[PDB]
Curated annotation (Swiss-Prot):
Disulfide bonds join 102-108. One of its GO terms (biological process) is cytochrome complex assembly. The chain holds residues 20 to 146 of 601 of the full protein. The keyword Signal applies. GO terms for molecular function: electron transfer activity; protein-disulfide reductase [NAD(P)H] activity; protein-disulfide reductase activity. Keywords: Cell inner membrane, Cell membrane, Cytochrome c-type biogenesis, Disulfide bond, Electron transport, Membrane, NAD, Oxidoreductase, Redox-active center, Signal, Transmembrane, Transmembrane helix, Transport. Belongs to the thioredoxin family. DsbD subfamily. Required to facilitate the formation of correct disulfide bonds in some periplasmic proteins and for the assembly of the periplasmic c-type cytochromes. Acts by transferring electrons from cytoplasmic thioredoxin to the periplasm. This transfer involves a cascade of disulfide bond formation and reduction steps. This is Thiol:disulfide interchange protein DsbD.
């Protein structure tokens, strides 16, 4: 609310995950602090009842080269992924998202995994 950027805040509030269920799939977007960045390759996000969903569709970010991973795509703030359905089903499914990155200042924190239960609602958030 005051900063919403830099490494002045913890890795908990530094990221604002948001779920959005659709009729043709599920979309998840997480706002990362300007002082943090997650590697597209390190980031994970899959939603389905039993591996039914097709494949993830990253929203694309910015490619950069470093020594903490090398030359790969990462996010400096915007990080959303599309999960297009691959099978017709009216039953509930499970979603697993994993975030992992470092602070633009020069900090390396551990990965954070979060599961979201989808059963009709649209918007979903972690009860942590």
């Amino acid at each position: 609310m005051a900063l919403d950027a830099n490494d002045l805040l913890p890795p908990e509030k530094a990221f604002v995950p948001e779920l959005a269920v659709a009729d043709d799939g599920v979309n998840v977007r997480f706002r990362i602090a300007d002082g943090y960045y997650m590697y597209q390759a390190k980031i994970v996000g899959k939603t389905n009842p039993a591996d039914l969903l097709g494949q993830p569709s990253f929203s694309k970010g910015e490619e950069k080269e470093d020594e903490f991973f090398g030359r790969q795509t990462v996010y400096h703030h915007e990080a959303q992924v599309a999960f297009p359905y691959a099978k017709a089903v009216g039953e509930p499914y499970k979603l697993v998202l994993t975030y992992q990155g470092s602070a633009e200042a020069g900090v390396c924190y551990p990965p954070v995994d979060t599961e979201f239960d989808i059963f009709g609602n649209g918007t979903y958030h972690p009860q942590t």
